[PDB]
Design a protein around this ligand. Structure first.
Ligand SMILES: CCCCCCCC/C=C/CCCCCCCC(=O)OC[C@H](O)CO
Ligand SMILES: NS(=O)(=O)c1cc2c(cc1Cl)N[C@H]([C@H]1C[C@H]3C=C[C@@H]1C3)NS2(=O)=O
Ligand SMILES: CCCCCCCCCCCCCCCC(=O)O
Ligand SMILES: CCCCCCCCCCCCCCCC(=O)O
Ligand SMILES: CCCCCCCCCCCCCCCC(=O)O
Ligand SMILES: CCCCCCCCCCCCCCCC(=O)O
Ligand SMILES: CCCCCCCCCCCCCCCC(=O)O
Ligand SMILES: CCCCCCCCCCCCCCCC(=O)O
Ligand SMILES: *C(=O)CCCCCCCCCCCCCCC
Ligand SMILES: N[C@@H](CCC(=O)O)C(=O)O
Ligand SMILES: [Ca+2]
Lengths: 83, 182, 179, 42, 196
């Protein structure tokens, strides 16, 4: 919503870009999935939203993949009393 | 207009849902004192000897040391500034939409409303994160109630309304260009 | 800056790699995302090739244990050495009245050991305790604003027993033994 | 044991994101206020 | 008029900031001793007392104690291979931090000479390369300095932050110098096309 807002609201640009309410959701979804194509934000306001979203994606996806390794490599747990 | 009507209805639903969530007490279901249906401000009692007794939650409990980063998280939590700030911004958005009808010449009051609803949604995200983070700093099962989801639902409504206000601002500014084309 | 320099300085070419588009291209590469513009020149492609190699090495190392750093509850302490007690005044400390850990302060000529004694004498209420477990327990109820001074063996015993709310910081200050 | 990530362990990245969105809206509006005022003169 | 002005200010600032960093020994705040300590144990009892230090690139000095205001030269070759000898030689010589100062000075002359030989345009480009090259040399110097110090707490000082701040200013000047070279040729081509 913020990416759409900062990219279309200003009337002193008119459609200056393809970042509508439907292409902003697609762009954000692709970025989070670590995919992406078609279009990238070209305005200063749009780039800021993309930059933080890219930063947000990098931590979350990396944390998921790194933590998933531990779940796949769960060591056999034993009760306190073992003899 | 049809688009205007859905904006008016959406604004009143988001404001009502957010207002209810702040005033209700069924945000969380956890075990403690007073099963307890803990709220945003006061926790109460469930199945047990006491079933209606409520007590104002002690958001600064003494058990140690108060880390300066931990002292500011509990200050924002205790004061619920962001959930309250979500209600205020939604209220302002409603006034801006109503003011637009009376004038219908400015065109910059429909944009102002859009900013408030988007800003209101961003505040609700912080309130949700702050509320969850504070609870996670306490102790082996819990489940959120309808009050928590009313705030989450209000965020979706608010963002949808914010989009409509922007689209109305865009549409109204498109008509002017057409009129100024001849 | 270098990517912008090589792609635009030459007047015999007059790409979209301005100063601000170069920053975006570099940021997108590091974030492991995709670009909208890609260099078409040998000099420009060298800059973009070594920045992809640099990104790969740096993002692989960072993502190695990102979750581990996020899920670690490291044990932090307020003080480590006995010198810390002298330099501050907030927390307090004492010794077992009529004991061998007390006479060692009075009869010591060391600056650190003489200074701590000074703080003790004029400490109302008195910090010395007639019985061992009257100090170690007062520490537990003091909300961390007291540090008892007792031998190592006892402090190791009263460290493994529940409620394990006490611990040892640093190493011993003298070496002696019973008899 | 193998614990799952909690929102507390990641809320830091959530505050930067929201901060960025607020800053981006501020940047866009400031450029809007500049053009709007300039257009009135012209 | 306002772009050339910023370049001169930026060049002077970056050059001044870097030469101060090289010449001021407040790069790192760590623990250490100042006296040579190798005094053949003349006094013996006066053993090296670890005190807060403010080291630099050439000389260390004491920040507290009875030795306050006493300085010493940093021994980079204490009492092996090809990875811990060349690195120390670079750190000891400080070639890159000094090289950055030289390049910034050379770039300043090109800017200064760009107000006499106005017809020549490659002078402005040469300045841009120097300021960009100087920034790249400042990166190496910082990396070498940090890497060598890894050979237990510390805190970098203002002098360290003056070289880092110089890198940013130098890179900004390089962008401004290249943009002047770009604008000049654009004007020169526009006029030539109009005459054609
Ligand atoms: C790897 C770690 C990086 C850490 C640092 C991150 C920040 C870097 C800044 C990027 C510039 C993004 C914004 C560039 C905006 C260019 C467009 C512009 O300025 O305006 C043109 C537009 O047509 C009208 O505004
Ligand atoms: N620091 S050390 O280990 O060299 C060390 C070790 C020892 C020291 C003194 C020192 Cl400095 N003294 C003690 C002695 C003091 C009195 C108590 C035990 C004997 C008699 N013996 S020890 O425990 O063997
Ligand atoms: C546009 C891309 C970047 C987005 C913003 C990234 C911000 C990085 C983290 C914030 C600064 C934190 C500084 C360290 C503070 C501390 O360690 O206490
Ligand atoms: C430009 C407007 C930005 C608004 C959003 C910024 C929110 C910043 C964080 C608010 C809550 C912080 C709670 C304490 C966190 C901590 O120190 O652990
Ligand atoms: C935290 C929420 C803040 C919301 C702020 C809303 C600001 C709306 C701005 C609308 C456009 C105003 C432009 C006026 C320009 C002018 O006439 O100078
Ligand atoms: C490119 C845009 C970047 C925007 C950066 C916004 C930074 C917001 C930081 C919020 C910090 C919340 C308070 C934490 C306090 C603390 O624990 O030190
Ligand atoms: C064509 C120009 C190339 C310029 C190359 C500049 C960087 C060269 C390497 C600088 C550091 C030297 C090695 C120090 C580390 C070591 O080997 O131990
Ligand atoms: C040892 C590393 C040195 C790095 C710095 C060297 C910079 C050299 C700059 C030369 C610029 C030449 C531009 C004009 C060329 C021409 O006349 O066509
Ligand atoms: C022209 O100069 C208009 C200025 C408008 C200033 C107000 C805009 C604020 C936008 C950021 C809001 C962030 C909210 C985050 C949650 C509270
Ligand atoms: N062991 C010492 C007492 C130790 C202490 O007071 O901490 C003694 O016999 O005097
Ligand atoms: Ca991996």
């Amino acid at each position: 919503v913020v990416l759409f807002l900062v990219s279309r609201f200003s009337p002193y640009e008119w459609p200056p870009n393809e970042f509508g309410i439907f292409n902003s959701l697609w762009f954000s979804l692709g970025a989070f999935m670590q995919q992406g194509c078609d279009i990238s934000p070209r305005s200063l306001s749009g780039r800021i939203v993309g930059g933080v979203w890219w930063f947000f994606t990098l931590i979350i996806i990396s944390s998921y993949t790194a933590n998933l390794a531990a779940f796949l490599t769960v060591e056999r747990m034993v009760s306190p009393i073992e003899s | 207009g049809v688009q205007m009507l859905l904006t008016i209805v959406g604004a009143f639903a988001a404001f009502s849902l957010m207002t209810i969530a702040v005033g209700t007490d069924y945000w969380l279901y956890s075990r403690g004192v007073c099963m307890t249906h803990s709220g945003l401000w006061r926790t109460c009692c469930l199945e047990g000897n006491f079933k209606g007794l409520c007590k104002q939650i002690d958001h600064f409990p003494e058990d140690y040391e108060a880390d300066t980063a931990e002292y500011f998280l509990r200050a924002v939590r205790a004061s619920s500034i962001f959930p309250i700030l979500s209600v205020i911004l939604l209220f302002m958005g409603g006034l801006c939409i109503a003011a637009s009808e009376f004038y219908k010449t400015r065109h910059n009051i429909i944009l102002s409303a859009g900013i408030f609803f988007v800003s209101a949604g961003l505040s609700n995200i912080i309130g949700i994160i702050v509320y969850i983070s504070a609870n996670a700093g306490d102790p082996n099962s819990y489940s959120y109630g309808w009050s928590f989801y009313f705030g989450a639902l209000s965020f979706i409504i608010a963002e949808m309304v914010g989009v409509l206000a922007v689209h109305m601002f865009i549409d109204r500014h498109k008509q002017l260009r057409a009129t100024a084309r001849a | 800056v270098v990517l912008f320099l090589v792609s635009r300085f030459s007047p015999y070419e007059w790409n979209e790699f301005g100063i601000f588009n170069s920053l975006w291209f570099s940021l997108g590469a590091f974030m492991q995302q995709g670009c909208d513009i890609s260099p078409r020149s040998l000099s420009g492609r060298i800059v973009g090739g070594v920045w992809w190699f640099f990104t790969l090495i740096i993002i692989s190392s960072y993502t190695a244990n990102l979750a581990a750093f996020l899920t670690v509850e490291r044990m932090v302490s307020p003080i480590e050495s006995a010198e810390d007690l002298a330099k501050q005044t907030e927390i307090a400390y004492g010794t077992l009245d009529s004991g061998s850990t007390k006479e060692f302060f009075r009869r010591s000529k060391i600056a650190v050991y003489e200074k701590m004694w000074t703080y003790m004498r004029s400490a109302e209420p008195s910090v010395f305790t007639r019985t061992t477990a009257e100090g170690v327990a007062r520490v537990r109820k003091s909300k961390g604003k007291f540090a008892f001074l007792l031998e190592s063996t006892m402090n190791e015993y009263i460290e493994q027993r529940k409620p394990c709310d006490t611990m040892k910081v640093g190493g011993n200050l003298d070496s002696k033994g019973y008899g | 044991k193998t614990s799952a990530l909690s929102l507390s362990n990641v809320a830091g990245v959530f505050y930067i994101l929201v901060g960025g969105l607020g800053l981006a809206m501020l940047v866009a509006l400031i450029e809007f206020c500049y053009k709007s005022r300039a257009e009135a003169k012209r | 008029g306002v772009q050339m002005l910023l370049t001169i200010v930026g060049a002077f600032a970056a050059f001044s900031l870097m030469t101060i960093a090289v010449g001021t020994d407040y790069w790192l705040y760590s623990r250490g001793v100042c006296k040579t300590k190798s005094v053949s144990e003349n006094e013996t009892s006066k053993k090296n007392e670890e005190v807060m230090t403010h080291s630099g690139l050439w000389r260390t000095c004491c920040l507290e104690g009875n030795f306050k205001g006493l300085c010493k030269q940093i021994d980079h070759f204490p009492e092996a291979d090809t990875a811990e000898y060349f690195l120390r030689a670079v750190r000891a010589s400080s070639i890159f931090p000094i090289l950055s100062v030289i390049l910034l000075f050379m770039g300043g002359l090109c800017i200064a000479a760009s107000e006499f030989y106005k017809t020549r345009h490659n002078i402005i480009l040469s300045a841009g390369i120097f300021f960009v090259s100087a920034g790249l040399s400042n990166i190496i110097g910082i990396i070498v300095y940090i890497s060598a110090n890894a050979g237990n707490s510390y805190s970098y000082g203002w002098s360290f932050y003056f070289g880092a701040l110089s890198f940013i200013i130098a890179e900004m000047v390089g962008v401004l110098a290249v943009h002047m070279f770009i604008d000049r040729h654009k004007q020169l081509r526009a006029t030539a096309r109009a005459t054609d």
